[PDB]
Curated annotation (Swiss-Prot), chain A:
Pathway the protein takes part in: Protein modification; protein ubiquitination
Record localization: Nucleus
Tissue expression per record: Overexpressed in prostate cancer cell line PC-3 and breast cancer cell line SK-BR-3.
Species assigned in the record: Homo sapiens
Complete-protein stretch covered: 18 to 112 of 112
Annotated protein name in UniProt: Elongin-C
Subunit structure: Heterotrimer of an A (ELOA, ELOA2 or ELOA3P), ELOB and ELOC subunit. The elongin BC complex interacts with EPOP; leading to recruit the elongin BC complex to Polycomb group (PcG) target genes, thereby restricting excessive activity of the PRC2/EED-EZH2 complex. (Microbial infection) Interacts with HIV-1 Vif; forming an active cullin-5-RING E3 ubiquitin-protein ligase complex (ECS complex).
Post-translational modification: Ubiquitinated by the DCX(AMBRA1) complex, leading to its degradation by the proteasome.
Keyword terms: Host-virus interaction, Nucleus, Transcription, Transcription regulation, Ubl conjugation, Ubl conjugation pathway
Nucleus recorded as keyword: yes
GO biological process, one term: ubiquitin-dependent protein catabolic process
GO molecular function: protein-macromolecule adaptor activity; transcription corepressor binding
Primary location: nucleus
Curated annotation (Swiss-Prot), chain B:
Keywords, alphabetical: Acetylation, Host-virus interaction, Nucleus, Phosphoprotein, Transcription, Transcription regulation, Ubl conjugation pathway
CDD domains xrefs: Ubl_ElonginB
Lineage: Eukaryota, Metazoa, Chordata, Craniata, Vertebrata
Gene name for this UniProt entry: ELOB
Subunit-level organization: Heterotrimer of an A (ELOA, ELOA2 or ELOA3P), ELOB and ELOC subunit. The elongin BC complex interacts with EPOP; leading to recruit the elongin BC complex to Polycomb group (PcG) target genes, thereby restricting excessive activity of the PRC2/EED-EZH2 complex. (Microbial infection) Following infection by HIV-1 virus, component of a cullin-5-RING E3 ubiquitin-protein ligase complex (ECS complex) hijacked by the HIV-1 Vif protein.
GO MF terms, alphabetically ordered: transcription corepressor binding; ubiquitin protein ligase binding
Pfam families for this protein: ubiquitin
Function comment: SIII, also known as elongin, is a general transcription elongation factor that increases the RNA polymerase II transcription elongation past template-encoded arresting sites. Subunit A is transcriptionally active and its transcription activity is strongly enhanced by binding to the dimeric complex of the SIII regulatory subunits B and C (elongin BC complex). Core component of multiple cullin-2 and cullin-5-RING E3 ubiquitin-protein ligase complexes (ECS complexes), which mediate the ubiquitination of target proteins. By binding to BC-box motifs it seems to link target recruitment subunits, like VHL and members of the SOCS box family, to Cullin/RBX1 modules that activate E2 ubiquitination enzymes. Component the von Hippel-Lindau ubiquitination complex CBC(VHL).
Primary localisation category: nucleus
Protein name: Elongin-B
Organism of provenance: Homo sapiens
Leader sequence residues: none
UniProtKB/Swiss-Prot annotation, chain C:
Record protein name field: Ankyrin repeat and SOCS box protein 9
GO cellular component terms given for this protein: Cul5-RING ubiquitin ligase complex; cytosol; mitochondrion
Localization: Mitochondrion
Residues in ANK repeats: 1-28, 32-61, 65-94, 97-126, 130-159, 162-191
Length: 82, 70, 257
């Protein structure tokens, strides 16, 4: 497990293998900090990690994304290279 | 296989499991060195990788830009 | 024998101006309801279209084979003719499924013509029984710049012909170029047609299309965000992405540039 820390103070603990989904994180890699990415975005990023790993080797379901978080989420994905 | 979000104060653990409530308390112990749902004291339909079930609020997303409204 | 039809066919704008000043009628039709305007559009003769419209030619007359000036202009490929008819209120969707301008323009890869039909309110997803969508024909006919145009404009990447999707039709073709494009715009690689088959199953054994349909597991989160954001805009409104507060690199990514 590794700890990903969001802009607004939240702490997310996810399995290291899953976080490596991010090029940026894989490269930086016990604890990581993201002064620019807020919790409501970073939680979705982690879910995408779970989703990516679980379905990365076999029918795949829709990954829901509310329009209201999409722009910030795109920036996060861009920075995180995932 | 079932995918949880175990939440408390400003921390959040993301983790999967099969299996009783008892043995999940042990996994937490594994992470946050403490010893052993909704307003109370979890399925493939109900808790998916992309939509973990939850076991402090997150930030409030900003206003949808005007050009993206219907 | 009509002098006016005859001049219109061959693009003889002088003979045409002449006949008109000698008193020959501009709205004159064969037994098949072909007019000079129909003939001039068919040959792409912009001068003669101008002349005929300016002397009151009818822009929506329908021939016995269900053809309209706009349809014929789409056959010829003259963007200018198409534009000018649209300016003059040429109706975008004619009644017959045998003569849909946008389909004819799309099947021959007349991109600019397609672009203009859509701009003037044509239904980019119009789905005809024996044909499918304009996107579908462009694909069958390997018209790459049409396909790219239709998708940028926001055509429905998954609406093809009957149960046969665009990605299916592209796999028969083996077009690597076009498959990659459909997928960039989120074609469903798992849909099954009327014969029960998924698109990867239609693809020659020797093609890299297989590895490609298989390797593409879920898309990146970036790709997923792009689908989602584009989905918020209507046909040909995606340019408004320009207004968003967003790095230029990403506006271009969202706009597929
Ligand atoms: Cl190709």
């Amino acid at each position: 497990y590794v700890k990903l820390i969001s802009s607004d103070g939240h702490e997310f603990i996810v399995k290291r293998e899953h976080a490596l989904t991010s090029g940026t994180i894989k490269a930086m890699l016990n604890e990581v900090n993201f002064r620019e990415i807020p919790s409501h975005v970073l939680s979705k990023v982690c879910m995408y990690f779970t989703y990516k790993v679980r379905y990365t080797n076999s029918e795949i379901p829709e990954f829901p994304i509310a329009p209201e978080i999409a722009l910030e989420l795109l920036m996060a994905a861009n920075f995180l290279d995932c | 296989d079932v995918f949880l979000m175990i939440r408390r104060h400003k921390t959040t653990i993301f983790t999967d499991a099969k299996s009783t409530v008892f043995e999940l308390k042990r996994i937490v112990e594994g992470i946050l060195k403490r010893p052993p749902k909704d307003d109370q004291l979890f399925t493939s339909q109900t808790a998916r990788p992309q939509a973990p079930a939850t076991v402090e609020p997150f930030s409030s997303p900003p206003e949808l830009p005007d050009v993206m409204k219907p | 024998w009509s002098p006016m039809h005859e001049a219109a066919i061959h693009g003889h704008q002088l003979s045409l101006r002449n006949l008109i000043s000698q008193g020959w009628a501009v709205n004159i039709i064969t037994a098949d309801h072909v007019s000079p305007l129909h003939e001039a559009c068919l040959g792409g003769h912009l001068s003669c279209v101008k002349i005929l419209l300016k002397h009151g030619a009818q822009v929506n007359g329908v021939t016995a084979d269900w053809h309209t000036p706009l349809f014929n202009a789409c056959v010829s490929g003259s963007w200018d003719c198409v534009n000018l008819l649209l300016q003059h209120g040429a109706s975008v969707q004619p009644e017959s499924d045998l003569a849909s301008p946008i389909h004819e323009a799309a099947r021959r890869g007349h991109v600019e013509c397609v672009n203009s039909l859509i701009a003037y309110g044509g239904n980019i997803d119009h789905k005809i029984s024996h044909l499918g969508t304009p996107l579908y024909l462009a694909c069958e006919n390997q018209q790459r710049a049409c396909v790219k145009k239709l998708l940028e404009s926001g055509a429905d990447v998954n609406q093809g012909k009957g149960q046969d999707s665009p990605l299916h039709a592209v796999a028969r073709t083996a077009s690597e170029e076009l498959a990659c494009l459909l997928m960039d715009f989120g074609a469903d690689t798992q849909a099954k047609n009327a014969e029960g088959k998924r698109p990867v199953e239609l693809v020659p054994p020797e093609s890299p299309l297989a590895q490609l349909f298989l390797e593409r597991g879920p898309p990146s989160l970036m790709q997923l965000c792009r689908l989602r954001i584009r989905k918020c805009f209507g046909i040909q409104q995606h340019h408004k992405i320009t207004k968003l507060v967003l790095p230029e690199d990403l506006k271009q990514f969202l706009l597929h540039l």
